[PDB]
């Protein structure tokens, strides 16, 4: 099923956008826990990451690259944490797969 | 020396021992000497990348198998209720062991914010 986050890739409803390209999509979270927190999200409509398949593995990747490289943009150079949240357990509050990037301030252990 | 130095290069080649849950030539996963949750164990390349904000472009594919290679032992793990997988990047990251690592965190309930 549709999420909040195919409107927020197909436009209808506004986010802070960082970075898209075709195939993914980086904007600010709605509800920051840190003084830098953003989602990078495929444009590929995968639920959650135990789902993904074998040929989505450059594209998973891709979302990781694509996250180093605006955590740089925005200034993060003393060093930031990124999250999959997986199912209920691990917290994960849409079901589109997001690549959390936080930073700006000391994250801590454990991560949740 | 393939790997590198740090505690994970030892552990790649066998020099130090680890309680390994799979292997192949770009990966390998194995549980973590501190678990911060009842089930927490750790991805890393075989190949040497020192911390995430040093991966080159090149190294998707690579990235991206950690993550599918997480995945598929969380499930054999048997973590049906979910877990949370976690790249720390340097100090405000708490990076601790530079050579990149994607922890998996589970069976228990993760909390939010991830730290
Ligand atoms: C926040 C921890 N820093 P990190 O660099 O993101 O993660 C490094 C992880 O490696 C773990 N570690 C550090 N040394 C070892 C070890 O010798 N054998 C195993 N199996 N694990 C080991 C350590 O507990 C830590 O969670
Ligand atoms: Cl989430």
């Given at each position: 099923g549709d999420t909040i986050f195919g409107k927020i890739i197909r436009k209808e409803i506004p986010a802070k956008i960082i970075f898209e390209d075709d195939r993914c999509l980086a904007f600010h979270d709605?509800?920051?826990?840190?003084?830098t927190h953003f989602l990078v999200i495929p444009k590929?409509?995968?639920?959650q990451i135990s789902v993904?398949?074998?040929?989505?593995e450059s594209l998973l990747g891709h979302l990781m690259i694509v996250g180093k490289k605006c955590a740089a943009d925005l200034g993060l150079n003393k060093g930031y944490r990124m999250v999959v949240n997986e199912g209920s357990d691990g917290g994960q509050s849409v079901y589109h797969v997001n690549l959390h990037v936080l930073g700006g301030r000391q994250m801590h252990w454990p991560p949740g």
């Open positions: 709605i509800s920051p826990q840190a003084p590929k409509h995968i639920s993904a398949e074998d040929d989505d």
